[PDB]
Amino acid sequence: TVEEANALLKWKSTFTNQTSSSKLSSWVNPNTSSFCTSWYGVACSLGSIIRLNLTNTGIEGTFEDFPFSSLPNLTFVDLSMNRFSGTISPEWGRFSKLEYFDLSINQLVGEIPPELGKLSNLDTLHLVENKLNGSIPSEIGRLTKVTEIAIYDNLLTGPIPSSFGNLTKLVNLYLFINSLSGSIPSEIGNLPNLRELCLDRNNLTGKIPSSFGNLKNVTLLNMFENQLSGEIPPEIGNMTALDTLSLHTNKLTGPIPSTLGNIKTLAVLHLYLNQLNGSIPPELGEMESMIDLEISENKLTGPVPDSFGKLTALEWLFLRDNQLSGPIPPGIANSTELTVLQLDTNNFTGFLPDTICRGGKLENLTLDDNHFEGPVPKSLRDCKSLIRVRFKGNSFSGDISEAFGVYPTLNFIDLSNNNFHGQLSANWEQSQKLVAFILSNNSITGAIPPEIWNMTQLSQLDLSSNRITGELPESISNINRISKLQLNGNRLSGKIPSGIRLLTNLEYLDLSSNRFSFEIPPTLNNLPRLYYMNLSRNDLDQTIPEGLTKLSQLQMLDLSYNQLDGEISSQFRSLQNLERLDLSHNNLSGQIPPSFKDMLALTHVDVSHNNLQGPIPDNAAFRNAPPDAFEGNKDLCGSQGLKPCS
Numbered sequence: 001t002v003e004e005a006n007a008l009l010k011w012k013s014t015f016t017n018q019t020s021s022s023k024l025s026s027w028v029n030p031n032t033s034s035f036c037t038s039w040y041g042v043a044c045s046l047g048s049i050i051r052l053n054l055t056n057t058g059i060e061g062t063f064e065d066f067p068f069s070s071l072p073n074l075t076f077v078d079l080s081m082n083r084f085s086g087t088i089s090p091e092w093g094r095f096s097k098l099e100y101f102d103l104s105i106n107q108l109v110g111e112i113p114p115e116l117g118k119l120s121n122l123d124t125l126h127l128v129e130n131k132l133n134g135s136i137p138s139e140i141g142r143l144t145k146v147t148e149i150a151i152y153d154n155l156l157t158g159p160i161p162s163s164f165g166n167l168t169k170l171v172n173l174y175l176f177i178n179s180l181s182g183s184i185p186s187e188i189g190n191l192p193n194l195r196e197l198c199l200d201r202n203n204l205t206g207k208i209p210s211s212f213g214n215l216k217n218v219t220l221l222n223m224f225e226n227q228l229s230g231e232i233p234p235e236i237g238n239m240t241a242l243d244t245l246s247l248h249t250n251k252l253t254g255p256i257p258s259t260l261g262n263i264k265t266l267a268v269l270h271l272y273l274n275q276l277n278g279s280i281p282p283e284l285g286e287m288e289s290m291i292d293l294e295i296s297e298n299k300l301t302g303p304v305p306d307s308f309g310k311l312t313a314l315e316w317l318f319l320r321d322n323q324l325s326g327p328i329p330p331g332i333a334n335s336t337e338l339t340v341l342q343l344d345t346n347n348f349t350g351f352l353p354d355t356i357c358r359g360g361k362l363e364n365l366t367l368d369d370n371h372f373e374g375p376v377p378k379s380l381r382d383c384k385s386l387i388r389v390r391f392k393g394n395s396f397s398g399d400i401s402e403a404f405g406v407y408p409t410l411n412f413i414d415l416s417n418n419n420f421h422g423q424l425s426a427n428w429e430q431s432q433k434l435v436a437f438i439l440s441n442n443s444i445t446g447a448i449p450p451e452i453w454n455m456t457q458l459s460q461l462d463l464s465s466n467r468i469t470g471e472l473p474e475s476i477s478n479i480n481r482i483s484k485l486q487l488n489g490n491r492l493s494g495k496i497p498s499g500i501r502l503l504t505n506l507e508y509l510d511l512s513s514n515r516f517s518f519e520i521p522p523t524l525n526n527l528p529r530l531y532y533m534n535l536s537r538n539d540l541d542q543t544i545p546e547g548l549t550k551l552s553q554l555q556m557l558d559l560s561y562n563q564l565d566g567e568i569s570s571q572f573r574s575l576q577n578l579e580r581l582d583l584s585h586n587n588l589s590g591q592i593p594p595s596f597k598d599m600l601a602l603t604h605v606d607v608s609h610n611n612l613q614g615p616i617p618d619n620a621a622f623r624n625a626p627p628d629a630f631e632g633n634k635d636l637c638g639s640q641g642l643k644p645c646s
């Protein structure tokens, strides 16, 4: 009507920063046949506006001059995705016909007025992504026809009103990302039509109401990242339409209720980061639909039940960081769909089962810091789908080249501190995307296959603390992405290859405790990320090359326990980031260069058991050094443990 159109024009005249490419260019002629046919966002019935849809039209303004008293037949209102600021007036509750009300994604502030509860015909209320604060008024519980309430991502405080139990037609309730507090009212459990209940990321406390067992149609229950406490009520097992139950990151205590096995529809169960204790009920194996079972970071004890072999759709099983113990039953890995088996930081014992990867789809197997032992099952040898294998801290045994097959998509493997023996196979080269190869402190013997240096995506290679023999070839330069190279504590012999000079991504190089002989390559001068170099405990000889002083990021340089001789270069002053320097147990002669006074970052120095003489340079490391950093030298003199200088 002319009066509705004139009133909307007056509201429009108040908008700011309007671009004249606005859709509202079409708001000109208030007569019908303009108003009801060509005004953007306006739809009428019998010449009167019943729908106002200005979503995402770049309006900046407020509702201060919104014409509440001029639009009596307003039925559908969508003002979302604009730049409306200010508050939500009580006058919005005078639109008696309103069915659909959306002010989301604006910059609205202040409290929700109780008058919204007067909208007795409302079907949908959306106020998401604003900065609304205060408590939800209890009068919202008068919206007896509403089927969806979404007020997520606001600044709401206070409890969820008990009056929400009167919202008998409510289907979806989305209140996540707020600061709602108090206990969940038990009246929520008596909403017969409820399908989705999302109260996650709030500050809710107290126990989950046992009334939730009356929620026979709820398919989604998200209440993660709250402060819920007490035990999960056994009545939850009567939510027999649940597809997804997420209670993670709460303060729940006591046992997992055995009645969860009653929920045959349940596909996703997230209970991690709680304080759940006791044994995993064997009835959890009856959750026939379960795909994604995550109960890590709890205080569960006892063994995993054999009934886990009945979970035939299982894909992800997260149990890390519990106190589970004992042997694992073959059923734990029996799902042909299993892709991730995550058991780290428990106290499991015995062998891996022969069911593992029987479906040919297992990807991530992580077992760190358990007590597993025995040989690798042949079905894991033959598991071509593996991406991540983490066995650190267990005691697996067997010949390493018999235990493992070929893994084309392997990305990361850590076998540190296991008990594997044998020689490395060239088969590892078929993991062309492998970025970390960690085999520290096994009983590996024999040579490094030359194919290893063709694993050009390697970023970490750690074969330390084995009994590996042979010489490093010049083609070591081919692992040109390597950033951490740890070959320490082996029996490698021959000269250190010059090709390491081309490993310009190297950050950390440990070749120590080997039998390397002859000179340190004089071309190691161009490793601009190298902060750690350890060549100690070898048989390296001749002079320390000046190229090492160009390794400007070095923080630690350890060349101790070699037969290096000649003088310490005064160009060491160039290592301005050097904190720790160990040259002890060598055959170095002459004076410690006075240029060490330039190295203000040095904190630790050891030159003991050399053939050095003369006074000690003036820097803090030398002043703070204990007598044994100097002992065993020829004629050092001081101004500790040294005779004073003349």
Ligand SMILES: *[C@@H]1O[C@H](CO)[C@@H](O[C@@H]2O[C@H](CO)[C@@H](O)[C@H](O)[C@H]2NC(C)=O)[C@H](O)[C@H]1NC(C)=O
Residues within 6 Å of the ligand: 045, 046, 048, 072, 073
């Ligand atoms: C638009 O609103 C007007 C004003 O409320 C409605 O007109 C009234 O209709 C009632 C019927 O409930 C009549 O008895 C009155 O004579 C009208 N009042 C006035 C002040 O004109 C109109 O029906 C509404 N139109 C639509 C399509 O909802």
Ligand SMILES: *[C@@H]1O[C@H](CO)[C@@H](O[C@@H]2O[C@H](CO)[C@@H](O)[C@H](O)[C@H]2NC(C)=O)[C@H](O)[C@H]1NC(C)=O
Residues within 6 Å of the ligand: 109, 110, 111, 133, 134, 135
């Ligand atoms: C909701 O937000 C408003 C706006 O920041 C808060 O309003 C302030 O309230 C205090 C005390 O009630 C007054 O002293 C200020 O002058 C108010 N500021 C404005 C801009 O109105 C309001 O307190 C908040 N409500 C809650 C419960 O936090």
Ligand SMILES: *[C@@H]1O[C@H](CO)[C@@H](O[C@@H]2O[C@H](CO)[C@@H](O)[C@H](O)[C@H]2NC(C)=O)[C@H](O)[C@H]1NC(C)=O
Residues within 6 Å of the ligand: 308, 309, 310, 312, 330, 331, 334, 335, 355
């Ligand atoms: C591994 O899973 C299979 C099913 O995928 C289990 O085999 C079924 O066992 C039940 C007995 O409870 C029989 O009624 C079915 O006929 C079996 N199906 C097939 C295809 O054999 C097997 O028991 C599971 N193994 C373990 C160790 O849990």
Ligand SMILES: *[C@@H]1O[C@H](CO)[C@@H](O[C@@H]2O[C@H](CO)[C@@H](O)[C@H](O)[C@H]2NC(C)=O)[C@H](O)[C@H]1NC(C)=O
Residues within 6 Å of the ligand: 345, 346, 347, 369, 370
């Ligand atoms: C059972 O497993 C737990 C977790 O893996 C072990 O606890 C760790 O023990 C080491 C060594 O004492 C500590 O450095 C860690 O801080 C502990 N981690 C945690 C998360 O507590 C525990 O030692 C194991 N029990 C036995 C008998 O080995």
Ligand SMILES: *[C@@H]1O[C@H](CO)[C@@H](O[C@@H]2O[C@H](CO)[C@@H](O)[C@H](O)[C@H]2NC(C)=O)[C@H](O)[C@H]1NC(C)=O
Residues within 6 Å of the ligand: 339, 340, 363, 364, 387, 388, 411
């Ligand atoms: C098994 O672990 C790997 C991590 O190494 C997962 O792969 C990564 O997934 C993210 C997506 O979340 C991708 O952006 C990365 O590119 C993937 N990395 C690699 C190396 O592929 C993989 O999704 C896990 N498997 C399952 C079923 O969760």
Ligand SMILES: *[C@@H]1O[C@H](CO)[C@@H](O[C@@H]2O[C@H](CO)[C@@H](O)[C@H](O)[C@H]2NC(C)=O)[C@H](O)[C@H]1NC(C)=O
Residues within 6 Å of the ligand: 488, 489, 512, 513, 534, 535, 536, 537, 556, 557, 558, 580, 582
């Ligand atoms: C360089 O590596 C050697 C091992 O090859 C580290 O040696 C340790 O040194 C301390 C004191 O010198 C001894 O108490 C340890 O017993 C040594 N360990 C071994 C396994 O021999 C040395 O610490 C490393 N240097 C730096 C700076 O990290």
Ligand SMILES: *[C@@H]1O[C@H](CO)[C@@H](O)[C@H](O)[C@H]1NC(C)=O
Residues within 6 Å of the ligand: 016, 017
């Ligand atoms: C106009 O727009 C800019 C940013 O959109 C803002 O700084 C200014 O406050 C706006 N309106 C005014 C000053 O009325």
Ligand SMILES: *[C@@H]1O[C@H](CO)[C@@H](O)[C@H](O)[C@H]1NC(C)=O
Residues within 6 Å of the ligand: 051, 053, 055, 076, 077, 078, 100
């Ligand atoms: C408003 O228009 C958008 C885009 O056409 C549409 O997706 C939305 O459902 C409309 N809302 C109403 C209440 O008409």
Ligand SMILES: *[C@@H]1O[C@H](CO)[C@@H](O)[C@H](O)[C@H]1NC(C)=O
Residues within 6 Å of the ligand: 141, 162, 163, 166
């Ligand atoms: C709505 O709930 C309140 C308690 O919050 C109750 O007093 C009232 O009677 C309920 N509604 C009806 C129609 O009774």
Ligand SMILES: *[C@@H]1O[C@H](CO)[C@@H](O)[C@H](O)[C@H]1NC(C)=O
Residues within 6 Å of the ligand: 253, 254, 255, 277, 278, 301
């Ligand atoms: C689990 O927690 C309760 C206290 O909340 C305690 O009574 C019980 O002994 C705990 N330990 C178990 C069940 O092993």
Ligand SMILES: *[C@@H]1O[C@H](CO)[C@@H](O)[C@H](O)[C@H]1NC(C)=O
Residues within 6 Å of the ligand: 417, 441
């Ligand atoms: C491997 O190192 C661990 C500590 O990391 C040590 O306790 C263990 O004895 C080493 N391996 C063997 C076989 O001794």
